[PDB]
């Protein structure tokens, strides 16, 4: 039983069409609760979740103000990174920033992180010790030295230690009805055949809130992974997630094949056997 | 923000924070918050009304920002018993003030012109949020 809060920031440069666009999102566990978009009717942090709307207008004014500060910072960041990398202004480059903090069942601090990337490759990350910046390229080294001289690591320590964790505990306590749920997967199984000499079996999990699920199809023996076509977790849009794990067996009409579903909602790893 | 007062709404927002904070707990917390606010406002006025700067002036701005950070941290110590996240926000504000001063030294004045506005913007937003939080704790009582 663990929870987390994360914030994602994507600033995409638009040469010629105007100023770069900005998308900011915030997650608790796997539920989004704040959004932003530079190309929006009202440039404010519009709420999504029902449990975040309980906050007063002062909180939303503060969040909008801080996100506008972040947007100006990211525009200047695109400019300065284009300056470092000596890249032509014709191209488009996408600055990406992550930061957040995780807590356990005790709701105490466990791990805070802050990552920053220029184009896919991670540019500057913050180590688990929350002291030194992991840098990759020469420009990353220059900005690492600038931030260490500017004493930025201590502020991020003070944030991800106390402020992020206390805000997360407030969010969980305020919205316990939505976040503290743990829905068991409504698993089932489906069958299909091709050419009457080979058949596909699919183990399905339909509705469950925690995104971490483990579907393992296997034979009478254990650990048969090579034959599994496993699809990454699919958000259904209602907050629940889905996943289907399938195998293509040659024998057909087999009771030797099993599906194991491991999830927080299930007290015991649920076993599904094919039903003729 | 390019004019003489880059952001004078920090003083008004901190005055609101003080008035909504005087109803609960001792008043020296409001004293520390308001003193830190006046130091931050003086530093922003001094850096904003720049001839475009003297290193000694840089040092003075650092002194005001660090003293405001000390006021914020003492307020965080004497407020964190009630509404712990408000105390955490105060600690973050103090560390932000210290890091802003450390930037002020190690930055060109033209580069710091925007960052002073950014720091004032963030601190004003945090002050408004803190005011709302202490206000709802007042309402719950």
């Amino acid at each position: 039983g663990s929870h987390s809060m994360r914030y994602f920031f994507t600033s995409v440069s638009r040469p010629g069409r105007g100023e770069p666009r900005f998308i900011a999102v915030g997650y608790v566990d796997d539920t989004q609760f704040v959004r932003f978009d530079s190309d929006a009717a009202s440039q404010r942090m519009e709420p999504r979740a029902p449990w975040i709307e309980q906050e007063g207008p002062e909180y939303w004014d503060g969040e909008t103000r801080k996100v506008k500060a972040h947007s100006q910072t990211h525009r200047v960041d695109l400019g300065t990174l284009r300056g470092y990398y000596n890249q032509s202004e014709a191209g488009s480059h996408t600055v990406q920033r992550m930061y957040g903090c995780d807590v356990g069942s005790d709701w105490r601090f466990l791990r805070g992180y802050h990552q920053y990337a220029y184009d896919g490759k991670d540019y500057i990350a913050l180590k688990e010790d929350l002291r030194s910046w992991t840098a990759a390229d020469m420009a990353a080294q220059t900005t690492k030295h600038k931030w260490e001289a500017a004493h930025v690591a201590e502020q991020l320590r003070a944030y991800l230690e106390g402020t992020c964790v206390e805000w997360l505990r407030r969010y969980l306590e305020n919205g316990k009805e939505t976040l503290q749920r743990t829905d068991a997967p409504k698993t089932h199984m489906t069958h299909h055949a091709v050419s009457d000499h080979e058949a596909t079996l699919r183990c399905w999990a339909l509705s469950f809130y925690p995104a971490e699920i483990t579907l393992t199809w296997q034979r009478d023996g254990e650990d048969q992974t090579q034959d599994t076509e496993l699809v990454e977790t699919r958000p259904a849009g209602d907050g629940t997630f889905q996943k289907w794990a399938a195998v293509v067996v040659p024998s057909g009409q087999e009771q030797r094949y099993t599906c194991h579903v491991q999830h927080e909602g299930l007290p015991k790893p649920l076993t599904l056997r094919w039903e003729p | 923000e390019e004019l003489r007062a880059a952001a004078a709404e920090l003083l008004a927002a901190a005055e609101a924070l003080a008035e909504e904070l005087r109803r609960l707990g001792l008043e020296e917390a409001a004293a520390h918050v308001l003193a830190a606010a006046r130091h931050v406002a003086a530093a922003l006025e001094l850096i904003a009304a720049t001839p475009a700067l003297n290193p000694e002036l840089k040092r003075e701005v650092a002194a005001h920002l660090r003293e405001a950070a000390a006021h914020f941290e003492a307020a965080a110590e004497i407020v964190a018993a009630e509404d712990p996240l408000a105390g955490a926000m105060l600690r973050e504000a103090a560390l932000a003030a210290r890091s802003m001063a450390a930037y002020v030294l190690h930055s060109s004045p033209e580069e710091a012109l925007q960052q002073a506005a950014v720091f004032a913007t963030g601190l004003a937003g945090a002050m408004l949020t803190m005011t709302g939080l202490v206000r709802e704790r007042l309402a719950a009582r």
Partner: peptide, 9 residues
Amino acid sequence: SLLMWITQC
């Protein structure tokens, strides 16, 4: 909430 003051990379 968010990080209050964010530096310029």
